[PDB]
Design a protein around this motif. Sequence first.
Motif, PDB file in Angstrom:
ATOM      1  N   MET A 151       0.825  -1.204   0.000  1.00 34.96           N
ATOM      2  CA  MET A 151       0.000   0.000   0.000  1.00 34.96           C
ATOM      3  C   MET A 151       0.861   1.256   0.000  1.00 34.96           C
ATOM      4  O   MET A 151       0.567   2.225  -0.712  1.00 34.96           O
ATOM      5  CB  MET A 151      -0.940  -0.011   1.206  1.00 34.96           C
ATOM      6  CG  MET A 151      -2.116  -0.997   1.149  1.00 34.96           C
ATOM      7  SD  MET A 151      -3.290  -0.828  -0.222  1.00 34.96           S
ATOM      8  CE  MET A 151      -2.491  -1.707  -1.566  1.00 34.96           C
ATOM      9  N   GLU A 152       1.926   1.262   0.805  1.00 36.87           N
ATOM     10  CA  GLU A 152       2.823   2.413   0.830  1.00 36.87           C
ATOM     11  C   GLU A 152       3.481   2.624  -0.527  1.00 36.87           C
ATOM     12  O   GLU A 152       3.586   3.763  -1.008  1.00 36.87           O
ATOM     13  CB  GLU A 152       3.883   2.230   1.916  1.00 36.87           C
ATOM     14  CG  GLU A 152       3.341   2.265   3.338  1.00 36.87           C
ATOM     15  CD  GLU A 152       2.797   3.626   3.725  1.00 36.87           C
ATOM     16  OE1 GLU A 152       1.590   3.869   3.511  1.00 36.87           O
ATOM     17  OE2 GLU A 152       3.577   4.453   4.240  1.00 36.87           O
ATOM     18  N   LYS A 153       3.923   1.536  -1.163  1.00 39.02           N
ATOM     19  CA  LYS A 153       4.528   1.647  -2.487  1.00 39.02           C
ATOM     20  C   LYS A 153       3.546   2.235  -3.493  1.00 39.02           C
ATOM     21  O   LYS A 153       3.901   3.121  -4.280  1.00 39.02           O
ATOM     22  CB  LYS A 153       5.016   0.276  -2.960  1.00 39.02           C
ATOM     23  CG  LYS A 153       6.266  -0.230  -2.260  1.00 39.02           C
ATOM     24  CD  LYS A 153       6.937  -1.319  -3.082  1.00 39.02           C
ATOM     25  CE  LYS A 153       8.035  -2.015  -2.298  1.00 39.02           C
ATOM     26  NZ  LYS A 153       7.483  -3.045  -1.375  1.00 39.02           N
ATOM     27  N   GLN A 154       2.301   1.753  -3.480  1.00 43.07           N
ATOM     28  CA  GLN A 154       1.310   2.254  -4.427  1.00 43.07           C
ATOM     29  C   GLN A 154       0.987   3.723  -4.176  1.00 43.07           C
ATOM     30  O   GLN A 154       0.835   4.502  -5.127  1.00 43.07           O
ATOM     31  CB  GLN A 154       0.039   1.405  -4.368  1.00 43.07           C
ATOM     32  CG  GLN A 154       0.252  -0.070  -4.683  1.00 43.07           C
ATOM     33  CD  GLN A 154       0.725  -0.310  -6.105  1.00 43.07           C
ATOM     34  OE1 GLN A 154       0.502   0.510  -6.995  1.00 43.07           O
ATOM     35  NE2 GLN A 154       1.381  -1.443  -6.325  1.00 43.07           N
ATOM     36  N   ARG A 155       0.871   4.122  -2.906  1.00 41.12           N
ATOM     37  CA  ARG A 155       0.608   5.523  -2.592  1.00 41.12           C
ATOM     38  C   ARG A 155       1.739   6.416  -3.090  1.00 41.12           C
ATOM     39  O   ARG A 155       1.498   7.475  -3.685  1.00 41.12           O
ATOM     40  CB  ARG A 155       0.415   5.701  -1.085  1.00 41.12           C
ATOM     41  CG  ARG A 155      -0.887   5.146  -0.537  1.00 41.12           C
ATOM     42  CD  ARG A 155      -0.884   5.182   0.983  1.00 41.12           C
ATOM     43  NE  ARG A 155      -2.100   4.618   1.557  1.00 41.12           N
ATOM     44  CZ  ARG A 155      -2.147   3.952   2.703  1.00 41.12           C
ATOM     45  NH1 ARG A 155      -1.061   3.747   3.427  1.00 41.12           N
ATOM     46  NH2 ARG A 155      -3.315   3.479   3.130  1.00 41.12           N
ATOM     47  N   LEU A 156       2.985   6.001  -2.851  1.00 45.47           N
ATOM     48  CA  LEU A 156       4.121   6.790  -3.315  1.00 45.47           C
ATOM     49  C   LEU A 156       4.144   6.877  -4.836  1.00 45.47           C
ATOM     50  O   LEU A 156       4.435   7.940  -5.402  1.00 45.47           O
ATOM     51  CB  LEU A 156       5.426   6.192  -2.792  1.00 45.47           C
ATOM     52  CG  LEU A 156       6.699   6.950  -3.165  1.00 45.47           C
ATOM     53  CD1 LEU A 156       6.600   8.402  -2.733  1.00 45.47           C
ATOM     54  CD2 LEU A 156       7.916   6.289  -2.545  1.00 45.47           C
ATOM     55  N   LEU A 157       3.841   5.769  -5.517  1.00 41.56           N
ATOM     56  CA  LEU A 157       3.818   5.790  -6.976  1.00 41.56           C
ATOM     57  C   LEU A 157       2.742   6.735  -7.499  1.00 41.56           C
ATOM     58  O   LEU A 157       2.976   7.477  -8.457  1.00 41.56           O
ATOM     59  CB  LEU A 157       3.608   4.379  -7.521  1.00 41.56           C
ATOM     60  CG  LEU A 157       4.860   3.502  -7.572  1.00 41.56           C
ATOM     61  CD1 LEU A 157       4.498   2.056  -7.858  1.00 41.56           C
ATOM     62  CD2 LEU A 157       5.837   4.025  -8.609  1.00 41.56           C
TER      63      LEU A 157
END
Length: 33
Positions: free
Chosen positions: A9-15
Motif C-alpha cells: 500500500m505504501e509503495k502504491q501511494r508513493l507511486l
Amino acid sequence: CHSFEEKEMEKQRLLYQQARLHNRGAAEMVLQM
C-alpha cells in the motif's frame, strides 16, 4: 511526495503521488534547470 500488505500500500501511494507530478512535465523542468 513524502506486514506485506502495508508495504505494498505504501509503495502504491508513493507511486500515485509521484505520478501526479511526472505526468505534467516535472522531469524535463528539473533537467532544464
